[PDB]
């Protein structure tokens, strides 16, 4: 567990991507290597897999001597990170001691000591699955549709055809459909190998999208009764990925 | 019995319906060729509400033949609150017993709202002998009602020829909102004799919760008579409250 | 008659009274022709607060009959929260036992707040041998107190000739805020001797709750001494807290 120093410009933007991931997760193992920071976890019900990738190119300074793994209480991490201001510089530093030093540099120098915990790691690999539909979408539309569907039901069907993407949610007598075609502003791209249908639980979806920005481009991949994969990019180089089990 | 009605500015339509559902829970809407109208009482039969939306405020108005539909206002309000300010609102009825509500913007979102049947009654808006008229900025009205609620549960309106006064007394504390024609908040005053009435703040607070701070409100009342309160939607729509006086 | 006092900016006056009410329940206001003065302690006798409003911040200041009034700070503060940022505020004492609070803007709004009888202590604002003075913006002071609250119940203030640091330590966690005159948050540092003290965060939280992020705050303290913080209102008025140290 050798010392490292990592610096990110924009503490608030870092906080907000940690808050997205923390919504499903309570404890995470961060793998720190020469090439960047990666984190891979499952939510307690083992229905969602989260995969974060922060390559070293998004850090203004990145000094890692040898690769190591640190365990972190995501709630306590998140409460500290929330104190960051939008033009603060964030510094994550470890010494010989077994705690993370989190510093905000801006109008003043604020440093928190975060204690490192032991997180037993599951055998987790991001499998490359045969998705038959891919959709790129304005976060606003996606956040919209999940909220709308929650008025009606607990589950949300995704339907991809060659020229339209539909989310549909039916209650006992109420019903909502959101429909997108490439003529529409919210939809940036749509590729379908064959017409695809699946359904996912809104509670999980709501938690996945709660931190996503209204203007960010979100990529969905799914298949008939397959997991749903959702991803967006951080500073164009980082990636956050969710893999969500279908409702069967 | 099909119709199709289009409104530019979905969130504005929501705010208008939200004003009405503050007191109402179920309503019959009469859809005629000349526009949409609605008339209902709150559950305690103290307040009557009248909503008139003429054809001219809709960007497209297609009505095959007059019809009445009954709506759960709360369900209507929950759906209508998901429209965005730049969305186009479409109210369409096919041949079945659902209202089809559509928001057109960055996406097409379509809800199906089931219709209900509503006990409609001998509900007419009579022209009572009002002796005072007041036009004032919604801001002044909304603040005078919040001011008075910290002091009492009733608000006394007092019109004389040169001053409009709203006054509220508790056991200890007092508040008086005074308006003369020299004040920015009073746009018009016409008083044919000294008029004095009192109304309950709980009802008043619900009537004005949804009124905008720069909307222009018209008040008509008479001594121990109902208070009539009007403001205009897009200059041609009209919402009217008629409120029973308190003893 | 006995006095008329006018302040332009009713919301700004409200915020000032709101900062003091965070720790006080009642207070005696002394209205002389030099200005209005107020000196109170919190219920636990740990914080002394001193407010001084010179007549030069009031747009009209007529005190016929010097007096001292007694005010329920929470009643006062819920009345003053009704003022708008563009209202003029008028405080009028007539012959009777009430304070007349008027907001003049869009309309004329008048409240009658009943005066009360406050058991006034004799409170000195003593001169103290402070070894350290710090001037910093509200934003950094307000953030250090919030950061320290995630860790502990008290924070240590530590001043050296070059550095001001606030440090809070829990069972396991730790927060350290450090300022040097290189940093935009610290506008002045004067340190006679290396000075160390600690204070309760709950009191500091309530002290800064009302301070604005742009406000400039002065801290004086000495080793194991009270902490004095003050900020200025319209350059001439002054609000001072004195906070007992922690053991």
DSSP output for B184-233: TTEEEEEESS-EEEEEEHHHHHHHHTTS-SS-EEEEEE-TTS-EEEEEEE
Give the residue carrying structure tokens 């009642």.
C26
Contact A133, A196 (CB under 8 A): yes
Contact B225, B149 (CB under 8 A): no
Measured CA to CA in angstroms, residue B175 lies from B144, B146, B165, C101 at distances of 9, 11, 10, 9
Which residues in A lie closer than 8 A to residue C186 (C-beta atoms)? 108
Residue B102, both tokens: 């559509």
| Distance in angstroms between the alpha carbons of the first and the last residue of chain C | 49
Q: Return the residue in C77, C90, C106 with the most chain B beta carbons within 10 A, the one to mutate for interface testing.
A: C106
- Residue C218's CB is within 10 A of a number of other CB atoms, namely 17
Residues in chain C: 247
Q: Read off φ and ψ for residue B73, nearest 5 degrees.
A: -60, -40
Residues in chain B: 247
Contact A145, A127 (CB under 8 A): no
- Residue A65's CB is within 10 A of a number of other CB atoms, namely 10
Question: Quick one: DSSP state of residue C212?
Answer: -
| Greatest C-alpha distance within chain B | 61
Across-strand partners of C153? none
Query: Chains meeting C at 3+ CB pairs closer than 8 A?
Result: A, B
Put residue A56 in one of left, alpha, beta given phi > 0 → left and psi -120 to 50 → alpha.
alpha
Put residue A236 in one of left, alpha, beta given phi > 0 → left and psi -120 to 50 → alpha.
left
Residue in chain A nearest C175 by alpha carbon:
A112
- Residue A172's CB is within 10 A of a number of other CB atoms, namely 8
State which H helix or E strand residue B100 sits in.
strand B98-104
What distance lies between CA C247 and its chain's CA centroid? 24
d(CA B130, CA B230) in angstroms, rounded, equals 14
d(CA C208, CA A116) in angstroms, rounded, equals 33
* Rg of the Cα atoms in chain C: 19
d(CA A228, CA A43) in angstroms, rounded, equals 15
For strand A187-192 and strand B227-233, is the pairing parallel, antiparallel, or unpaired? Answer: unpaired
Does the CB of C109 have a partner CB in chain B at under 8 Å?
yes
d(CA C70, CA C159) in angstroms, rounded, equals 39
Residue B122: burial class (beta carbons within 10 Å; 0-12, 13-18, 19+): exposed
Which residues in C lie closer than 8 A to residue B147 (C-beta atoms)? 82, 109, 111
Cβ distance of C114 and B185 shorter than 8 Å: no
| Distance in angstroms between the alpha carbons of the first and the last residue of chain B | 46
Contact B242, B48 (CB under 8 A): yes
Put residue C205 in one of left, alpha, beta given phi > 0 → left and psi -120 to 50 → alpha.
alpha
Residue A156, both tokens: 């949300």
Q: To 5 degrees, how large is the angle CA C65–CA C68–CA C74?
A: 130
Contact A158, A199 (CB under 8 A): yes
Measured CA to CA in angstroms, residue A20 lies from A154, A206, B162, C44 at distances of 21, 11, 60, 43
Contact A41, A8 (CB under 8 A): no
Residue C138, both tokens: 């509200």
List of residues 6+ apart from C126 with CB closer than 8 A:
none
Q: Read off φ and ψ for residue A198, nearest 5 degrees.
A: -165, 170
List of residues 6+ apart from B226 with CB closer than 8 A:
B128, B242, B243, B244, B245
Angle, helices A11-22/A74-81, rounded to nearest 10 degrees = 150
Contact B49, B40 (CB under 8 A): yes
Contact A246, A200 (CB under 8 A): yes
Residue A64, both tokens: 């890692």
Measured CA to CA in angstroms, residue C55 lies from B15, B123, C5, C6, C58 at distances of 46, 61, 9, 10, 6
Q: In what order do the strands lie in the sheet with C3-8?
A: B195-200, B154-159, B163-169, B174-180, C108-114, C98-104, C88-93, C3-8, C60-62
d(CA A223, CA A245) in angstroms, rounded, equals 11
Contact A204, A195 (CB under 8 A): no
Contact C194, C234 (CB under 8 A): no
Residue C133: burial class (beta carbons within 10 Å; 0-12, 13-18, 19+): middle
Q: Read off φ and ψ for residue C227, nearest 5 degrees.
A: -110, 130
What distance lies between CA A23 and its chain's CA centroid? 9
Side-chain-side CA neighbours of A33 within 13 Å: the count stands at 9
Residue B218, both tokens: 């018209």
- Residue A159's CB is within 10 A of a number of other CB atoms, namely 17
d(CA C54, CA C239) in angstroms, rounded, equals 12
- Residue A55's CB is within 10 A of a number of other CB atoms, namely 16
Contact A144, A156 (CB under 8 A): no
The SS3 call for residue C82 is coil
Instruction: Please spell the DSSP secondary structure of C92-159, one letter per residue.
Output: EE-SSSEEEEEEESSSEEEEEEEP----------------EEEEEEHHHHHHHHHHHHTT-SEEEEEE
Give me the residue from C177, C184, C186 closest to A110, CB to CB.
C177
Dihedral of CA A205/A206/A211/A214: which sign?
Answer: positive
Angle, helices B138-149/B201-208, rounded to nearest 10 degrees = 150
Which residues in B lie closer than 8 A to residue A177 (C-beta atoms)? 109-110
Cβ distance of B140 and C110 shorter than 8 Å: no
d(CA A225, CA A196) in angstroms, rounded, equals 9
Cβ distance of C173 and A112 shorter than 8 Å: yes
Q: To 5 degrees, how large is the angle CA A158–CA A162–CA A166?
A: 25
Angle, helices B73-80/B10-21, rounded to nearest 10 degrees = 150
Residue in chain C nearest B147 by alpha carbon:
C82
d(CA C54, CA C34) in angstroms, rounded, equals 6
DSSP collapsed to 3 states, A76-140: HHHHHHCCCCCCCEEEEEECCCCEEEEEEECCCEEEEEEECECCCCCCCCCCCCCCCEEEEEEHH
d(CA B244, CA B48) in angstroms, rounded, equals 9
List of residues 6+ apart from A97 with CB closer than 8 A:
none
Q: Read off φ and ψ for residue C121, nearest 5 degrees.
A: -70, 165
Measured CA to CA in angstroms, residue C158 lies from B22, B223, C169, C181, C191 at distances of 56, 70, 14, 15, 10
List of residues 6+ apart from B239 with CB closer than 8 A:
B16, B19, B20, B49, B50, B51, B52, B230, B231, B232, B233
Does the CB of C114 have a partner CB in chain B at under 8 Å?
yes
Tell me the structure's resolution in angstroms, rounded to a single decimal.
2.8
Instruction: Please spell the DSSP secondary structure of B40-83, one letter per residue.
Output: EE-TTSSEEEEEEEEGGGSSEEEESS-EEEEEEHHHHHHHHTT-
Contact B212, C140 (CB under 8 A): no
Give the residue carrying structure tokens 């309309």.
C107
Q: Method of determination?
A: X-ray
Contact C145, C208 (CB under 8 A): yes
Instruction: Indicate the Cα dihedral angle A62, A63, A66, A69, nearest 10°.
Output: -50
Q: To 5 degrees, how large is the angle CA A55–CA A57–CA A63?
A: 85
d(CA C33, CA B66) in angstroms, rounded, equals 74
Which residues in C lie closer than 8 A to residue A80 (C-beta atoms)? 150
Contact A175, B111 (CB under 8 A): yes
Side-chain-side CA neighbours of C57 within 13 Å: the count stands at 18
For strand A133-138 and strand A217-222, is the pairing parallel, antiparallel, or unpaired? Answer: antiparallel
State which H helix or E strand residue C164 sits in.
strand C163-169
What distance lies between CA A10 and its chain's CA centroid? 18
Residues in chain A: 248
Give the residue carrying structure tokens 């807290």.
C241
| Distance in angstroms between the alpha carbons of the first and the last residue of chain A | 43
d(CA B94, CA B110) in angstroms, rounded, equals 14
Measured CA to CA in angstroms, residue A113 lies from A18, A27, A90, C56, C148 at distances of 17, 17, 14, 48, 12
Residue B71: burial class (beta carbons within 10 Å; 0-12, 13-18, 19+): buried
* Rg of the Cα atoms in chain A: 19
Contact B178, C107 (CB under 8 A): yes
Does the CB of B72 have a partner CB in chain A at under 8 Å?
no
d(CA A245, CA A227) in angstroms, rounded, equals 5
For strand A48-55 and strand B26-31, is the pairing parallel, antiparallel, or unpaired? Answer: unpaired
d(CA B160, CA B169) in angstroms, rounded, equals 20
d(CA C177, CA C137) in angstroms, rounded, equals 14
Give me the residue from B146, B147, B183 closest to C106, CB to CB.
B183
Does the CB of A156 have a partner CB in chain B at under 8 Å?
no
Q: Smallest Cα–Cα separation from C217: which of C175, C171, C166, C149?
A: C166
Measured CA to CA in angstroms, residue C58 lies from B227, C7, C9, C73, C243 at distances of 41, 5, 10, 21, 29
Residue in chain C nearest A114 by alpha carbon:
C173
């Amino acid at each position: 567990h050798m010392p490292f120093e990592i610096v990110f410009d924009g503490a608030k933007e870092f906080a907000d991507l940690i808050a997205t991931a923390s919504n499903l997760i309570d404890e995470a193992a961060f793998k720190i290597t020469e090439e960047g920071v990666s984190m891979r976890a499952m939510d307690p019900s083992r229905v969602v897999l989260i995969d974060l990738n922060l390559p070293e190119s998004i850090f203004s300074k990145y000094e890692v001597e040898e690769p190591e793994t640190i365990g972190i209480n995501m709630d306590h991490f998140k409460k500290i990170l929330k104190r960051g201001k939008s033009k603060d510089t964030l510094i994550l530093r470890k010494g010989d001691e077994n705690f993370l030093e989190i510093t905000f540099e801006g109008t003043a120098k604020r440093t928190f000591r975060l204690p490192l915990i032991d997180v037993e790691e599951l055998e987790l690999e991001l499998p490359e699955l045969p998705f038959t539909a891919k959709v790129v979408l304005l976060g606003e539309v996606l956040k919209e549709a999940i909220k709308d569907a929650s008025l009606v039901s607990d589950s949300l069907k995704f339907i991809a055809k060659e020229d339209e993407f539909t989310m549909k949610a039916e209650g006992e007598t109420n019903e909502v459909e959101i429909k997108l075609t490439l003529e529409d502003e919210g939809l940036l791209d749509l590729e379908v190998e064959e017409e695809t249908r699946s359904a996912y639980g809104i509670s999980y979806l709501a938690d996945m999208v709660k931190g996503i920005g209204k203007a960010d481009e979100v990529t969905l991949r799914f298949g008939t009764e397959m997991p749903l994969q959702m991803d967006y990019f951080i500073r164009d180089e980082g990636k956050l990925t969710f893999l969500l089990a279908p409702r069967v």
